[PDB]
Design a protein around this nucleic acid. Structure first.
Lengths: 99, 100, 79, 151, 127, 114
RNA sequence: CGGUCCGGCCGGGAACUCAAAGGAGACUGCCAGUGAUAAACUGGAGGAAGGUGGGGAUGACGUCAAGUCAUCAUGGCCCUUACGACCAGGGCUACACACGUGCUACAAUGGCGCAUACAAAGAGAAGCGACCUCGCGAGAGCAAGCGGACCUCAUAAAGUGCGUCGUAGUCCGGAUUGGAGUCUGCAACUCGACUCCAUGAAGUCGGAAUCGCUAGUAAUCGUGGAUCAGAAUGCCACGGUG
């Protein structure tokens, strides 16, 4: 079966350590790995007034970047499902897993 | 804001979860539906008798810290003032100053 | 306008009016319901609607039916 | 500007004729960044022109333009209260710009129906030199000769 | 043989294949005449085939995404001229002098907090 | 030629000329000229006298001119005499539909007084 | 490359656009001349870019007892059966006036009607809501999909072609008012937005004065977002033409 892993995370160095684990972990336990293809990157934007009272043109424009990566696995062994389930990454990565 | 006005926005959440979220979400469909009953609504008259602060309309957002009504931001649950204080210490993750 | 699935009135006005039609006409009703559509069954009565301080006597004509109660108490003084 | 002595931008030549001097005329005539509809108006009112003054479409422009082209203008200049209109001999490039600009302020002023009428009739009357664009060039050549004293 | 160029201008990104043999111009599977309904936009896709020769010498199949009309034009212009320098090479001398090799850097300036647009300030009042 | 309203349109197109009735706009127009089976580009001169008396019947469906001017005036009078809010705004010459009066009510108030 | 319902749609392809990680590139580095052999300057070459290539972020010591005790914190003063607390109705929307900032206009570079092309950047689960059906329309009914490069908001508009109006307070302009609706909401009287029919003010380019802008700028054209049940001509952002 196809299982595919959408990794997403606010830090771009933290995410492609967590990718490069998963590309190593699958290849060693016997599988054909696809990707890790870079999807586009939701950048939100918040402008805010900056003074406590008045001064409408004094502002501070923040962003959050959300980086997004996709890793398809085409040939699962019975090991390769459990090798990735048992893995644990940094806190700022969010994994998913469709089936 | 005041302590009274922060207490009022616990009172109005307390209700609207208990009532309308179940019981008025029935009656807003009975007052809607055209292809079932057009005479024994009764429900329009019964929707008044529910306590008035059961409506979610009546809930303002405050900044979950200072209680300020204006300047709200839904992503963070905070006033523009406290967003910025918290941003700059590094307490909101991934948030930095932008430029493009 | 309230779309044609409803017209609107407060219960505490509806039932206080059913009384003083059925029992017989009287000293006027004191409502604060300004938001309440004048029905056919209210005609003849004096209702005294709240303007923001004083309740103001309103003899309900035939021609008033459809209008709201609040339309006949003005809120703001002016000269 | 003080320090900042500068070059200038290559305008594209005009697609129908290959005429760089006529592209400047659609720019001058253009409003609200609608160069499209400027070109419609211009290309039209050269057909209406060149037909009715014995042909050549580049050179029915450049006869009407040569007529309104100035050669001196004033350049007002304070000495210590009263203000001295000094005649000054105008540059090669600015000759055309002023000509083109006056044609169009003349054309934009008349009361014919289209703009392509209005333009065609204040390029007719330029070449047979009456109408407002040469009444402008004459009342500039007054001011230069009336104040010829001051140069 | 397929000789390729990319070209870009504003948000447009054109991709331009050059075949030997004949007059013909395709562009999102339409005729040059169908695609551009403005004369100004036509005689800037042809421009580079004038300094360098074509009547009936190379076909070109091109496709373009994004921007508007005069953006797409300019991207194609630049796309051709990259592809010409793939094929022949020693035409750069002449193309450089008309300056079709210069990728046109001009984006829209962003809008700025405080201002109605990029540079349009609001109306000042002294008093 | 004059229409079932005691009026006289011009030598324009027809759909435009019927607008010249009080109580007829551009929607009613095209609605009339249709049922009667006239083309809308066609003029008033270049229209035969059977093709005009069909229009007189069509506009007699709709309430127009001194039927209408009355109908409006009488509805405004219900409000004025009944003494509801909207009546009180009609009789002072102030705007009725909740618009601001601190500035700008200059249609409804007239050119201004010191 | 094969096959086709002519749709990248389906075999397949990894070239190309694009996506987002990692690197290269521009430093007066090279050539000539000017210059106290200096710093530098003027020009040239190659180069995608040339002399801080364009844009942002970045605001020295200080200045005005500038602003904010009503975000928050806080010294002191003050109130403590009230200046604290709960509720319904009203008010913050008032209108002889004066000023500021905007939007729409006054029209043929145009208005209306019919066809037809080319964006970017965003948002979405008490959410976005297709298709089909009903309604002149605002919308309604049914109901896939989508925590989203997949689905939805969502047909960009100026543009272009064809018709039409003929310089008229008009087929310019849309204010105002009457009638009838739609939706959100316990509730649209005071005081919401949007639709339909009717009505069709002022206004024919604005006195003294005065503002913005040096290039993808001004001008003009649409698109999205935050706030938000509903309520953008404001605000923040995005591309088009130019």
């Amino acid at each position: 079966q196809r299982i595919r892993i959408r990794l997403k995370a606010f830090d771009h160095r933290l995410i492609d350590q967590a990718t490069a684990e998963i590309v190593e972990t699958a290849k060693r336990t016997g599988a054909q790995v696809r990707g890790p293809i870079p999807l586009p990157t939701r950048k939100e934007r918040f402008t805010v007034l900056i003074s406590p009272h008045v001064n409408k043109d004094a502002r501070d424009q923040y962003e959050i970047r959300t980086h997004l990566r996709l890793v398809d696995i085409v040939e699962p062994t019975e090991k390769t499902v459990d090798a990735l389930m048992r893995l644990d990454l940094a806190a700022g990565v969010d994994v998913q897993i469709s089936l | 804001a005041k302590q009274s006005m922060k207490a009022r926005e616990v009172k109005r959440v307390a209700l609207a979860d208990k009532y309308f979220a179940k019981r008025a979400e029935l009656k807003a469909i009975i007052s809607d539906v055209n292809a079932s009953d057009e005479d024994r609504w009764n429900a329009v008259l019964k929707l008044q008798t529910l306590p008035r602060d059961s409506s979610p309309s009546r809930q303002r957002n405050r900044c979950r810290q200072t209680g300020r009504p204006h300047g709200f931001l839904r992503k963070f649950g905070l006033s523009r003032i406290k967003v910025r204080e918290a941003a700059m210490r590094g307490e909101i993750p991934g948030l930095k100053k932008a430029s493009w | 306008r309230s779309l044609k699935k409803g017209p609107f009135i407060d219960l505490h006005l509806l039932k206080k009016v059913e009384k003083a039609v059925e029992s017989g006409d009287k000293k006027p009703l004191r409502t604060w319901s300004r938001r309440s559509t004048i029905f056919p069954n209210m005609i003849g009565l004096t209702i005294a609607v709240h303007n923001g301080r004083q309740h103001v006597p309103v003899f309900v004509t035939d021609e008033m039916v459809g209008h709201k109660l609040g339309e006949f108490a003005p809120t703001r003084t002016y000269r | 500007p003080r320090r900042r002595v500068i070059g200038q931008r290559k305008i594209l030549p005009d697609p129908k004729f290959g005429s760089e001097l006529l592209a400047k005329f659609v720019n001058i005539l253009m409003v609200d960044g609608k160069k499209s509809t400027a070109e419609s108006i211009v290309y039209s009112a050269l057909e209406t022109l060149a037909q009715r003054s014995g042909k050549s479409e580049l050179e029915a422009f450049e006869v009407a333009l040569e007529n309104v082209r100035p050669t001196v203008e004033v350049k007002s200049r304070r000495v210590g209260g009263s203000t001295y209109q000094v005649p000054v001999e105008v540059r090669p490039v600015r000759r055309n710009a002023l000509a083109m600009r006056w044609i169009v302020e003349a054309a934009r002023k008349r009361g014919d129906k289209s703009m392509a009428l209005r333009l065609a009739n204040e390029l007719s009357d330029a070449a047979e030199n009456k109408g407002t664009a040469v009444k402008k060039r004459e009342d500039v050549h007054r001011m230069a000769e009336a104040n010829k004293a001051f140069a | 043989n397929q000789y390729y160029g990319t070209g870009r201008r504003k948000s447009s990104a054109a991709r331009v294949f050059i075949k030997p043999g004949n007059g013909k111009i395709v562009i999102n599977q339409r005729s040059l005449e169908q695609y551009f309904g403005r004369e100004t936009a036509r005689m800037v896709v042809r421009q580079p085939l004038e300094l360098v020769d074509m009547v009936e010498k190379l076909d070109l199949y091109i496709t373009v995404k994004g921007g508007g009309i005069s953006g797409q034009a300019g991207a194609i212009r630049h796309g051709i001229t990259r592809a010409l320098m793939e094929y022949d090479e020693s035409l750069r001398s002449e193309l450089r002098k008309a300056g079709f090799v210069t990728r046109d850097a001009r984006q829209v300036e962003r809008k700025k907090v405080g201002l109605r647009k990029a540079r349009r300030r609001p109306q000042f009042s002294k008093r | 030629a004059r229409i079932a309203g005691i009026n006289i349109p011009d030598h324009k197109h027809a759909v435009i000329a019927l607008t010249s009735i009080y109580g007829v706009g551009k929607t009613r127009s095209k609605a009339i000229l249709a049922a009667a089976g006239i083309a809308e580009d066609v003029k008033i001169s270049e229209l035969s006298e059977g093709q005009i008396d069909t229009l007189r019947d069509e506009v007699a469906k709709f309430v127009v001119e001194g039927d209408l001017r009355r109908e409006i005036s009488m509805s405004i009078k219900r409000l004025m005499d009944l003494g509801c809010y909207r009546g009180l705004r009609h009789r002072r010459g102030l705007p009725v539909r909740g618009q601001r009066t601190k500035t700008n009510a200059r249609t409804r108030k007239g050119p201004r007084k010191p």
